[PDB]
Amino acid sequence: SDSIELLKQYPKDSSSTFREWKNLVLKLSQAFGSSATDISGELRDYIEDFLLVIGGNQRKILQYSRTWYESFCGFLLYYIPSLELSAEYLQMSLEANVVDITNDWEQPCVDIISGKIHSILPVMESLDSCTAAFTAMICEAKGLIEDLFSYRNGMASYMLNSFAFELCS
Amino acid sequence: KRDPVSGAILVPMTVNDQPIEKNGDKMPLKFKLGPLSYQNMAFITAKDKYKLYPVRIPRLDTSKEFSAYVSGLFEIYRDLGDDRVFNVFAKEHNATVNLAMEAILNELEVFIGRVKDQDGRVNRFYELEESLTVLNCLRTMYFILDGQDVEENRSEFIESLLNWINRSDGEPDEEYIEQVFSAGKKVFETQYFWKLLNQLVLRGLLSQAIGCIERSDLLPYLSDTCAVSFDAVSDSIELLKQYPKDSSSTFREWKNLVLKLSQAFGSSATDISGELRDYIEDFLLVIGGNQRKILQYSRTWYESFCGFLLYYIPSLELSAEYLQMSLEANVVDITNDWEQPCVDIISGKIHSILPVMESLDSCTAAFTAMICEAKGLILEDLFSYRNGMASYMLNSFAFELCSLGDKELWPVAIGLIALSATGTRSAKKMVIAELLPHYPFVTNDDIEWMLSICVEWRLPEIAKEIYTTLGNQMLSAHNIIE
Amino acid sequence: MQPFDSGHDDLVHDVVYDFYGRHVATCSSDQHIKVFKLDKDTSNWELSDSWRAHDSSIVAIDWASPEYGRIIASASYDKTVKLWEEDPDQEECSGRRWNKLCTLNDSKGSLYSVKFAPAHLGLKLACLGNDGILRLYDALEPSDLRSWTLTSEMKVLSIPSDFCLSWCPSRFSPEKLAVSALEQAIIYQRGKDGKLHVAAKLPGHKSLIRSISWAPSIGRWYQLIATGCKDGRIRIFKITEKSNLQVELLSEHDDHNGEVWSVSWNLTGTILSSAGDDGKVRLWKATYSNEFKCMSVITA
User: Fold this and answer.
1) DSSP at B12
2) Full strand arrangement of the beta sheet holding C58-62
3) Which of B365-369's residues contact partners 24+ apart within 8 Å by CB, and which partners?
4) A contact residues 13-32, partner B, Cβ 8 Å cutoff
5) Of A58, A102, B27, B363, which is most buried with the most CB atoms under 10 A?
6) Is the Cβ pair A29, C252 closer than 8 Å?
7) Which long-range contacts (C-beta less than 8 Å, at least 24 apart) are formed by A22-28?
C-alpha cells in the first residue's frame, strides 16, 4: 500500500525530490525485506522483486525487462539518472535481450546512445530522405559529426544536396 | 587458457595437490585475500584437510619487466604537462600528444619484447600482443592525421595501417602458402591461388604478392599462350613493385596507370582460358579499387577495410562506409579479442574498448584510456563515475599498485592519484592518508619520502605514527649502554 | 604456489594475515594457535611458533594495528577470549613466544568470532558468543596492555547456529559494526550518547550467514559489506549515510551452487573473494555502474 502510494508521487520535476524518493523506497524494501511473512513464500518474492525494481536493483531491472530499451529506461528511472553510465546501461541491456530487426528504429537508437551517430543517417534516408537530410544537418550543428556533391564536404552537407536535387524533380 | 561454467577464466590452485575431488563430496572451503597480491591464502575446515594453500591472484604480473613498464608509462604521463586534459594551441597540442602515443605504443613493444624472451610465450604474452594490436589500430585512426586525409602524411599513415593489419594475426602464415603449391588445373587456374594472391594484395603484402605470381605462369604459360595476357600481367607486377607510400600525388598517378592498364586489358582480345581471363581482371579490378571486388576477395572484414584505403579512396571520411561494407561481407570474429574493439575504434565509439583492454592488462588499458581522453576521444567520491571514466581506470590502477608490494611503484601509485585532474584537493588528501599506512617501508630513504608526503599533503597524523616507529627502534637501540 | 602442513592435529578454523601481510595466524580444534612467517629470500612459509592457547576448540583470530604492538587475539568454545603479546626476545617453535595479556571470562556461552575494531577508534575489540550477546572490550589505557574494560554489552537475539562480525575500516566515517547471527545481519553504530544502537539490517538471507566483512571505503563515502550465505549466494550491499542509513542491494550471485563459506576483501576494497562447497574461489571486481562481475576463478 505504501508502494502504490509512493508510486503515485514519483519525482518528475525536482532532482532532490528523487533522492528523497529513492530514499524512502529503499527504507521500505528494507523493512519488508527483514520482517515476517504470512503470505505465500512465492508471492513474497514477486513483491520483493517489484520493490527491488522500484529501487533500481540493476540485477532485477534486467531480469524483468522484455526488451533492451526497457531495461535501459528503468536504469535511468530507478537507479542512477546519469547519462554517464549511458554506455554501461546499454551493454547490460543488449546483453540481456538482443536488438530486434523487425523494427527499424531500434538499431539507430542503440547507435545514438552508443555515440556513433553518423550510422543512423543512412537508415533515416530509406524512411524519408527529407527528415534524414535535416536530421543530419542539425546533428552537425550540435557537433555530433569542384565536387560540391562529394564526400570531402560533410556527409551532412551531402545529404542536403541529395534532397535539394531530388526536389527539382 | 580455460573458461568455466560461471563465465570468466579458470585456474587450478595447485599442479600436484588438488584437495577437493569427486562431485557430491562438498567441504567448507575458506579463502582470504592478502595485503599482498601475490600472497593470499586458501584453506579448508575439515578433518584430514590441514594444509594451508597460498594463492596468487590469477594473471598477476610481478615481472621486473612490468614494474619497468609501469615506470615508463608514468613518465610519459607526468611529462604531458597540463596537456593530459582537453578543455571542453589548436595544432601544437595534438602533435605533442600523438608523440606520447608513439612513446606509449613503444614502451609496450619493449615490454612485449623482454616478455617473449624471459618466459617464451606464456598467457601474459599474447594478451599484450593483442593489447598492442588494438593500440596500433587506435593510433592509425586518430593519432596520425590530426585533421586532414591520407594526404597530410601518406608516408606515416599507410605505414601504421599496414603495420596494424599485419601486427594482428600471423596469417597468411608461411605454412599455408606451400600447400597452395602442391588436378587437371595448374597452380594458377584454381581460385585457391588467386583468393590468396588477392589477399596478399589487400593486406599490402606486395613483396610476396609478386613472389606468388613468379612461382608459375608469369614468364611461363602466359608468355607462351596470350600476347596481351603476358603483358597486362607483367606491367602489373611491375606497377606493384612501386606502390606509392610517400607521395600523395604519386598515388593519383599510380591509380591512374593501373586504371589505364585494366581498361586496356579489359577491351582487348584474349587467347587464354575464358576462366583465367576473369581471375586476371579481378586481380586488376582489385588493384584498381573496385569496391565490388575488394569485398568479394576479402576473407575477413579488416581485410576489405584496408584494401578500400589502399586501392580506392584514401580518406578516413568514408571510414564509416568502408566498415559497413566490410562487416556486411564477413562478420566480426569472437575468437580474437582485438576485433570488436577495433570495429569500435573505427566506428567511433571508443569508450567501449577500455573495458576489454582491462581484462587483458589493467595497466595498458588504464593508460590507453588516459591518453584517449587527452586526444579528446571521451561528491566525495574520487573513485566515482562523476570524474572522467579515464580517471576511473587510472585510480583503479593506482590502487592495484598498492597491493603489489613493489615499494618502487608506490610513488607511481600515489602521484598518479594526485595528478588525476578530476577530484577535490581534499578528495585525494583522504585516499592518500588511507593508502599510506600500508606503504611497505624499509630504508631511511623510503621513510624520508613518506614524510615528504606528510608535508605536501599535510597528514599530521600519519606523521606522528611514523615518529612512533622510530620510537620502537630507538628503544631497542637504548639496549646498548655497552 | 605450494601448500604446507599447518601442523594442526585437528581441523583448522581461521587464518589471519597481520597488517603487512607477512605473517598468518592459524587456529584449529587442536586447541593450538600457530603463527607462520613469510621468508623474504625464499618464497616459502615456515612456522614461527605453535602453542596451546585454549582448552577447547579455537575458532577465530585477528591481529591488532602494529601501532599498538604485536597483539594476536583469539576466541574459543571454552566460552572465553584470550590476548597474546608477542615476545621479541624469545625463541621460535618454543612455546614461550606469546603471553596471555589477559582473559575475558564474561561470555557465559561458547564464543564464535572476535575482531579488533579499526585503529582510529583505539585498541578495542568485539566478540560474539552463542548466548547472542555482543561484548566490546578495550584497554582504556594503551600503556598497560593487560587490563581491558567492558565498554558495551548488547544482546542480539535468541538461541534455539553460526555467527561472525566485521567493523567498518574507514577512518573517516562514524564508528559502526556489522554483526550477523544466523539468518540475520544487523548493523550497529555509535550514538551521540556513546552507547550502541541498531542503525540498519541487511535483508535478503534465506539461511545462516557463514561470513560477512566490511570493505575499505577508500576514495568513497558509500560503504560496502559482503555476505556469504548458507543458501549459496553472495550479496553485496551499498550502505550510504545521509535513523539515517540507506541499505541497497547491489549484486547477488549463485555462481557457487553450494554454500558461500568465506567472503573476503582486498586491502583497498577493489577485489572481493568468495569460497564455497564447489571448492572454487571466485574473485569479483566492480563495474563503472557498480554491479559486480567475476574476474577469475580458482579450483581443486
Assistant:
1) -
2) C58-62, C71-76, C81-86, C98-104
3) B365/B131, B365/B393, B366/B393, B366/B394, B366/B396, B366/B397, B367/B73, B367/B76, B367/B77, B367/B104, B367/B394, B368/B104, B368/B134, B368/B135, B368/B138, B369/B393, B369/B394
4) none
5) A58
6) no
7) A22/A55, A22/A56, A22/A78, A23/C242, A23/C246, A25/A51, A25/A54, A25/A55, A25/A78, A26/A55, A26/C246, A26/C247, A26/C248, A27/C243, A27/C246, A28/A2, A28/A3
> How far B32 CA sits from the closest chain A CA (Å)?
26
Q: Specify the resolution in Å.
A: 3.8
Residue with grid cell 607510400, as numbered in its chain: B245
Question: From the CA of B37, how many Å to the nearest CA of chain C?
Answer: 9
Phi, then psi, of C139 in degrees rounded to 5: -70, 90
CB C27 within 8 A of CB C12: yes
For residue C195 the three cell numbers come to 552507547
What distance in Å separates residue B345's CA from the closest CA in chain C? Answer: 20
Q: Is C26 on the interface with B (CB under 8 A)?
A: yes
Asked if B386 reaches chain A (Cβ–Cβ under 8 Å), the answer is yes
Q: Tell me which DSSP letter residue C281 carries.
A: E
Cα distance between residue B198 and residue B9, in whole Å? 38
Cα C49 from Cα C92, distance rounded (Å): 5
Instruction: State how beta strands C292-298 and B9-11 pair.
Output: parallel
What are the two backbone dihedrals, phi and then psi, of residue B52, each rounded to the nearest 5 degrees? -105, 115
| Sheet arrangement for strand C272-276 | B9-11, C292-298, C281-286, C272-276, C260-265
Identify from A121, A151, A159 which residue to disrupt to test chain B contact, counting B C-beta atoms within 10 A and taking the largest count.
A151
* B134: phi then psi, degrees, rounded to nearest 5: -50, -45
- What span, in angstroms and rounded, lies between the C-alpha atoms of B101 and B135? 9
Of C17, C262, C290, the CB nearest to B35: C17
Q: Quick one: cell of B139?
A: 593510433
Q: Which residue of A has its CA nearest to B323?
A: A119
Which domains does chain C carry? 1-241+246-300 (2.130.10.10)
Question: Strand pairing of C272-276 and C260-265?
Answer: antiparallel
Domain residue spans in chain B? 57-482
The CB-based long-range contact list for C29-38 (8 Å cut-off, 24+ gap) reads C29/C57, C29/C58, C31/C55, C31/C56, C31/C57, C31/C58, C31/C76, C32/C8, C32/C58, C33/C58, C33/C61, C33/C72, C33/C74, C33/C84, C33/C98, C34/C6, C34/C7, C34/C8, C35/C72, C35/C86, C35/C98, C36/B52, C38/B39
Task: At B10, give phi and psi (nearest 5°).
Answer: -115, 115
Residue with cell 566492480: C286
One-letter amino acid at A129 equals S
CB B339 within 8 A of CB B130: no
List chains touching A (3+ CB pairs under 8 A).
Answer: B, C
Nearest CA of chain B to the CA of C249: how many Å?
Answer: 18
Q: Say whether B29 and C275 touch across the interface (CB within 8 A).
A: yes
State the maximum Cα–Cα separation within chain C, in Å, rounded to a whole number: 53
Question: What value, to the nearest 5°, has the Cα angle with vertex B292 and ends B289 and B297?
Answer: 80
* Cross-chain CB nearest to A114 (options B317, B349, B385): B349
Q: CB distance from A147 to chain B under 8 Å? A: no
Chain C contact set for A85 (CB, 8 A): 288-289
Give the residues across from B137 on adjacent strands: none
Judging contacts by C-beta atoms under 8 Å, the chain A residues touching residue B347 are: 116, 119
Q: Distance of alpha carbon B430 from its chain centroid, rounded? A: 34
Look at A33 and C204 and tell me if their CB atoms are within 8 Å: yes
On chain B, the residues whose CB falls within 8 A of the CB of C276 are: 29
Closest-CA residue of A relative to B386 is A84
Name every chain B residue with its beta carbon within 8 A of the beta carbon of C12: 43-45, 49-50, 52
Give the Cα separation of C238 and C249 in Å (integer). Answer: 6
